[PDB]
Amino acid sequence: SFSGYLKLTDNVYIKNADIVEEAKKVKPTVVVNAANVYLKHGGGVAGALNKATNNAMQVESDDYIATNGPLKVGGSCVLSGHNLAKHCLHVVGPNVNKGEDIQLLKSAYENFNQHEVLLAPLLSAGIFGADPIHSLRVCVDTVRTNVYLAVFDKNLYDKLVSSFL
């Protein structure tokens, strides 16, 4: 199962790990993607997850967008997890670098509550430009299901754990 995760709360766990490597190892029921409204998996977690699926996640996502149109910021869709997970929950956190509303981060985390257990990144962190300390705070205060957070950056992981209230 998941291993080496530090317990933050009753249901939130955290580890300094590459989410792609965690997904290939654990093969969880749900891996969360840090998606944009277009499901264009170019960089960050999305680019890395997509690259691990040999671009199959992108092909599937483009068919989904062609049929359904874009997601909302704060919204999500469930697609295949390909070789990484049974499912991929593509969640759109606000991208503060693109001027999106940070108040939508709580709405984005609410999507996790539809799944009993998930492997996930911190939403809106990294290239999405939000404060990762704030993202972890919103995560612990919003998610009620079991979330295993994979934090790619070592120094950020240490800062998140040492500053966690």
Rosetta silent file (secondary structure, phi, psi, omega in degrees, C-alpha in Angstrom):
SEQUENCE: SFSGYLKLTDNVYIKNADIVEEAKKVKPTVVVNAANVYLKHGGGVAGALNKATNNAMQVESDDYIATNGPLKVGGSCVLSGHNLAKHCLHVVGPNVNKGEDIQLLKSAYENFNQHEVLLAPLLSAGIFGADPIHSLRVCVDTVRTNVYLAVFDKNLYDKLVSSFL
SCORE:     score description
SCORE:     0.000 S_00000001
   1 L     0.000 -156.075  174.826    0.000    0.000    0.000 S_00000001
   2 L   -71.337  139.074  177.830    1.182    3.635    0.630 S_00000001
   3 L  -141.804  150.997  179.228    4.362    3.669    2.750 S_00000001
   4 L    78.906   15.938  178.082    6.638    6.284    4.318 S_00000001
   5 L   -88.879  132.149  176.039    3.815    8.847    4.741 S_00000001
   6 E   -86.326  133.014  178.986    3.896   11.129    7.768 S_00000001
   7 E   -78.629  123.360  177.841    0.443   11.510    9.393 S_00000001
   8 L   -98.315  -44.829  178.998   -0.692   15.167    9.593 S_00000001
   9 L  -137.990 -173.316  175.296   -4.321   14.643   10.663 S_00000001
  10 L   -50.684  -37.070 -172.359   -6.863   11.767   11.001 S_00000001
  11 L  -127.272   -2.430 -179.595   -7.087   11.580    7.169 S_00000001
  12 E  -112.426  125.552  179.876   -4.226   13.609    5.658 S_00000001
  13 E  -121.709  155.728 -176.551   -0.786   12.034    5.094 S_00000001
  14 E  -144.233  147.890 -179.978    2.286   13.516    3.414 S_00000001
  15 E  -151.050  145.786  174.970    5.551   12.314    1.843 S_00000001
  16 E   -83.401  102.449 -176.327    8.461   13.859   -0.085 S_00000001
  17 L  -157.585  154.475  175.841    7.961   11.862   -3.265 S_00000001
  18 L   -81.135  118.897 -177.876    7.589   12.096   -7.016 S_00000001
  19 H   -58.191  -32.064  177.595    3.831   11.472   -7.587 S_00000001
  20 H   -67.509  -45.019  179.043    4.597    9.550  -10.856 S_00000001
  21 H   -66.082  -36.192  175.817    6.968    7.234   -9.015 S_00000001
  22 H   -64.691  -45.142  178.749    4.449    6.881   -6.174 S_00000001
  23 H   -62.439  -45.301  178.366    1.700    6.026   -8.714 S_00000001
  24 H   -62.958  -29.353 -178.080    3.852    3.409  -10.532 S_00000001
  25 H   -83.275  -51.579 -176.126    4.680    1.848   -7.102 S_00000001
  26 H   -80.497  -38.985 -171.438    1.303    2.016   -5.260 S_00000001
  27 L    50.919   58.322 -173.974   -0.981    1.889   -8.364 S_00000001
  28 L   -63.699  167.563  174.205   -3.720    3.577   -6.320 S_00000001
  29 L   -65.491  -39.768 -179.811   -7.421    3.500   -7.101 S_00000001
  30 E  -134.384  125.070  168.489   -7.241    7.290   -7.705 S_00000001
  31 E  -108.558  131.475  179.216   -4.329    9.490   -8.622 S_00000001
  32 E   -88.964  132.336  172.866   -5.127   13.232   -8.623 S_00000001
  33 E  -101.459  139.969  174.733   -3.842   15.317  -11.499 S_00000001
  34 E   -86.482   80.146 -173.903   -3.170   19.059  -11.055 S_00000001
  35 E   -85.545  164.344  167.868   -5.107   19.865  -14.216 S_00000001
  36 L  -107.819  169.004 -175.312   -6.043   23.074  -16.086 S_00000001
  37 L   -60.264  -22.883 -179.268   -9.595   23.642  -17.517 S_00000001
  38 L   -91.804   -4.832 -172.758   -8.460   22.427  -20.948 S_00000001
  39 L    54.513   39.662  176.192   -6.823   19.223  -19.676 S_00000001
  40 L   -95.453  100.019 -171.293   -3.646   20.306  -21.531 S_00000001
  41 L   -87.535   73.457 -174.809   -1.028   18.331  -19.554 S_00000001
  42 L   -88.235  -49.088 -175.536    2.038   20.351  -20.457 S_00000001
  43 L  -139.530 -177.644 -178.777    4.055   20.855  -17.303 S_00000001
  44 H    60.529 -147.759  177.230    4.198   20.274  -13.564 S_00000001
  45 H   -56.992  -43.223 -177.479    2.324   17.270  -12.197 S_00000001
  46 H   -60.343  -47.266  179.330    0.111   17.120  -15.322 S_00000001
  47 H   -62.411  -41.902 -179.723    3.049   16.962  -17.741 S_00000001
  48 H   -67.943  -43.897  179.170    4.811   14.352  -15.634 S_00000001
  49 H   -63.894  -46.476  179.898    1.687   12.121  -15.215 S_00000001
  50 H   -59.368  -45.127  179.874    0.882   12.432  -18.934 S_00000001
  51 H   -60.410  -38.897  177.170    4.493   11.594  -19.943 S_00000001
  52 H   -64.664  -28.270  176.038    4.346    8.437  -17.736 S_00000001
  53 L   -86.768    8.709 -179.350    1.213    7.322  -19.631 S_00000001
  54 L    62.414   33.953 -179.476    3.087    7.701  -23.006 S_00000001
  55 L    73.487    2.425  178.423    0.687   10.587  -23.872 S_00000001
  56 H   -63.942  -34.106  177.175   -2.398    8.274  -23.523 S_00000001
  57 H   -62.276  -41.129  179.455   -3.751   10.603  -20.784 S_00000001
  58 H   -65.871  -43.384  179.994   -3.562   13.558  -23.236 S_00000001
  59 H   -60.844  -45.727  178.711   -5.314   11.667  -26.059 S_00000001
  60 H   -63.986  -40.690  179.491   -8.100   10.621  -23.704 S_00000001
  61 H   -65.909  -39.422  179.347   -8.326   14.168  -22.261 S_00000001
  62 H   -66.482  -37.683  176.881   -8.581   15.768  -25.730 S_00000001
  63 H   -65.375  -41.445  179.505  -11.480   13.403  -26.589 S_00000001
  64 H   -61.046  -45.358 -179.660  -13.120   14.347  -23.235 S_00000001
  65 H   -66.546  -40.237  178.203  -12.726   18.110  -23.995 S_00000001
  66 H   -59.298  -35.265 -177.670  -13.988   17.668  -27.585 S_00000001
  67 H   -84.191  -43.752 -171.336  -17.160   16.042  -26.167 S_00000001
  68 H  -107.338  -12.805 -173.691  -17.756   18.032  -22.961 S_00000001
  69 L    79.119  178.824 -175.394  -15.951   21.362  -23.266 S_00000001
  70 L   -71.056  159.899  174.436  -13.599   22.685  -20.594 S_00000001
  71 L   -76.956  173.139  173.748  -13.768   22.084  -16.867 S_00000001
  72 L   -96.614  155.598  171.021  -14.465   24.962  -14.430 S_00000001
  73 L   -68.737  127.337 -174.402  -11.668   26.302  -12.140 S_00000001
  74 L    97.522   -8.910 -178.456  -12.415   24.382   -8.903 S_00000001
  75 L   -98.164 -179.285 -177.284  -13.961   21.513  -10.868 S_00000001
  76 E  -154.919  165.791  169.664  -12.943   18.003  -11.792 S_00000001
  77 E  -145.740  150.701  176.805  -13.526   15.008  -14.001 S_00000001
  78 E  -100.183  120.951  176.265  -12.743   11.287  -13.561 S_00000001
  79 E  -125.774 -177.498  179.571  -10.811    9.675  -16.396 S_00000001
  80 E   -66.710  150.501  173.970   -8.640    6.505  -16.696 S_00000001
  81 L   -92.861   -1.624  179.394   -5.477    6.292  -14.614 S_00000001
  82 L    54.634 -124.592  179.613   -3.833    4.282  -17.454 S_00000001
  83 L   -87.145    1.262 -174.519   -0.612    2.606  -16.097 S_00000001
  84 L  -102.315  -32.613 -173.761   -0.574    4.847  -12.970 S_00000001
  85 L  -162.504  169.460  173.162   -3.886    4.219  -11.231 S_00000001
  86 L   -65.728  -47.274  179.522   -7.384    2.747  -11.807 S_00000001
  87 E  -130.017  156.542  170.066   -8.630    6.354  -12.237 S_00000001
  88 E  -117.667  120.875  175.060   -7.229    9.817  -12.579 S_00000001
  89 E   -92.665  104.526 -179.838   -9.198   12.587  -10.891 S_00000001
  90 E   -82.165  109.490 -178.345   -8.277   15.694  -12.895 S_00000001
  91 E  -111.565  130.732  178.307   -8.774   18.568  -10.476 S_00000001
  92 E   -96.445  102.858  172.331   -8.485   22.218  -11.489 S_00000001
  93 L   -85.551  156.224  176.159   -7.039   24.368   -8.741 S_00000001
  94 L   -62.127  135.062  174.326   -6.846   28.147   -9.347 S_00000001
  95 L   -96.428  105.104  178.445   -3.679   29.186  -11.142 S_00000001
  96 H   -66.005  -29.577  177.355   -2.732   32.491   -9.375 S_00000001
  97 H   -64.222  -30.829  175.986   -0.020   33.018  -12.124 S_00000001
  98 H   -93.932   14.813  179.937   -2.931   33.180  -14.650 S_00000001
  99 L    69.561   16.892  178.094   -4.889   35.550  -12.305 S_00000001
 100 L   -72.657  155.065 -174.199   -7.455   32.873  -11.246 S_00000001
 101 L   -74.231  117.685  179.896   -9.313   33.265   -7.910 S_00000001
 102 L   -61.978  -24.960  176.111   -7.468   31.652   -4.888 S_00000001
 103 L   -60.780  -21.255  178.254  -10.860   31.317   -3.068 S_00000001
 104 H   -76.009   -4.060  179.489  -11.614   28.467   -5.541 S_00000001
 105 H   -65.285  -38.061  177.469   -8.899   26.294   -3.905 S_00000001
 106 H   -63.511  -43.789  176.779  -11.397   25.049   -1.285 S_00000001
 107 H   -58.616  -42.006  177.954  -13.861   24.137   -4.097 S_00000001
 108 H   -59.425  -46.435  179.498  -11.033   22.303   -5.881 S_00000001
 109 H   -65.494  -28.255  178.804  -10.232   20.227   -2.741 S_00000001
 110 H   -58.523  -26.782  176.823  -13.945   19.378   -2.283 S_00000001
 111 H   -59.481  -31.062 -178.515  -13.620   17.125   -5.339 S_00000001
 112 H   -63.363  -27.670 -178.174  -11.398   14.757   -3.226 S_00000001
 113 H   -65.439  -12.957  176.438  -14.370   14.014   -0.924 S_00000001
 114 H   -83.741    0.549 -177.167  -16.014   11.940   -3.683 S_00000001
 115 L  -131.429  130.998 -176.313  -13.218    9.321   -3.372 S_00000001
 116 L   -64.267  -36.993  177.693  -12.440    7.263   -0.257 S_00000001
 117 E  -143.651  139.458 -178.545   -8.668    7.277   -0.822 S_00000001
 118 E  -142.172  148.601  167.450   -6.450    9.283   -3.162 S_00000001
 119 E   -98.553  126.367 -174.285   -2.789    9.824   -4.038 S_00000001
 120 E  -146.531  156.755  168.260   -2.553   13.605   -4.709 S_00000001
 121 L   -92.181  171.519  173.268   -0.339   16.637   -5.137 S_00000001
 122 L   -75.751  122.810 -177.438   -0.955   19.938   -3.251 S_00000001
 123 L   -68.867  143.113  179.534   -3.443   21.811   -5.421 S_00000001
 124 L    65.851    5.629  177.274   -2.439   25.183   -6.889 S_00000001
 125 L   -85.383  176.484  179.441    1.166   24.647   -5.598 S_00000001
 126 H    66.565 -137.472 -177.151    4.261   24.639   -7.865 S_00000001
 127 H   -64.436   -8.623  174.078    3.811   26.290  -11.248 S_00000001
 128 H   -75.883  -12.064  171.730    0.171   27.134  -10.234 S_00000001
 129 L    79.971   -1.161  179.836    1.720   29.885   -8.037 S_00000001
 130 L   -81.272  162.692  177.103   -0.252   29.562   -4.790 S_00000001
 131 L   -72.779  117.724 -177.791    1.438   29.388   -1.362 S_00000001
 132 H   -62.638  -28.162  175.810    1.872   25.612   -0.685 S_00000001
 133 H   -63.752  -45.361  176.088    1.547   26.201    3.092 S_00000001
 134 H   -62.168  -43.125  178.773   -1.891   27.740    2.445 S_00000001
 135 H   -58.594  -42.907  177.792   -2.766   24.804    0.064 S_00000001
 136 H   -64.816  -38.793  178.576   -1.958   22.207    2.768 S_00000001
 137 H   -61.512  -49.409  178.528   -4.075   24.234    5.260 S_00000001
 138 H   -62.079  -40.713  176.863   -7.049   24.257    2.839 S_00000001
 139 H   -56.332  -56.382 -177.425   -6.494   20.535    2.157 S_00000001
 140 H   -62.641  -32.535  179.758   -6.592   19.490    5.848 S_00000001
 141 H   -84.117   -8.018 -176.099   -9.619   21.801    6.516 S_00000001
 142 H  -119.148  -45.007 -178.888  -11.605   20.596    3.440 S_00000001
 143 L   -76.729  128.948  177.065  -10.771   16.972    2.619 S_00000001
 144 L  -108.200  -19.229  177.428  -12.497   14.352    4.844 S_00000001
 145 L   -84.424  171.626 -175.708  -11.459   11.267    2.801 S_00000001
 146 E   -78.117  110.913 -178.739   -7.964    9.625    3.033 S_00000001
 147 E  -114.386  126.826  179.479   -5.479   11.742    1.076 S_00000001
 148 E  -107.554  105.736 -176.566   -1.825   10.780    0.582 S_00000001
 149 E   -87.192  126.369  175.919    0.008   13.904   -0.503 S_00000001
 150 E  -105.103  115.855 -179.562    3.127   13.520   -2.583 S_00000001
 151 E  -104.084  113.755 -176.247    5.325   16.672   -2.341 S_00000001
 152 L   -63.348  -49.854 -175.343    7.954   16.628   -5.074 S_00000001
 153 L   -75.043  122.031 -179.139   10.257   19.317   -3.651 S_00000001
 154 H   -60.412  -48.840 -178.837   12.372   18.200   -0.612 S_00000001
 155 H   -65.628  -36.474  174.350   12.872   21.681    0.894 S_00000001
 156 H   -67.203  -44.596  177.643    9.186   22.469    0.462 S_00000001
 157 H   -53.781  -47.793  179.664    8.305   19.114    2.140 S_00000001
 158 H   -62.218  -42.007  179.073   10.495   20.020    5.151 S_00000001
 159 H   -65.438  -40.018  179.141    8.988   23.524    5.346 S_00000001
 160 H   -64.709  -47.459 -178.565    5.411   22.133    5.115 S_00000001
 161 H   -66.286  -49.812 -178.204    5.959   19.555    7.881 S_00000001
 162 H   -65.412  -22.968 -179.919    7.913   21.896   10.219 S_00000001
 163 H  -101.837   -3.356 -176.783    5.353   24.731    9.858 S_00000001
 164 L   -64.749  121.719 -179.548    2.175   22.564   10.045 S_00000001
 165 L   -82.580    0.000    0.000   -0.183   23.782   12.743 S_00000001
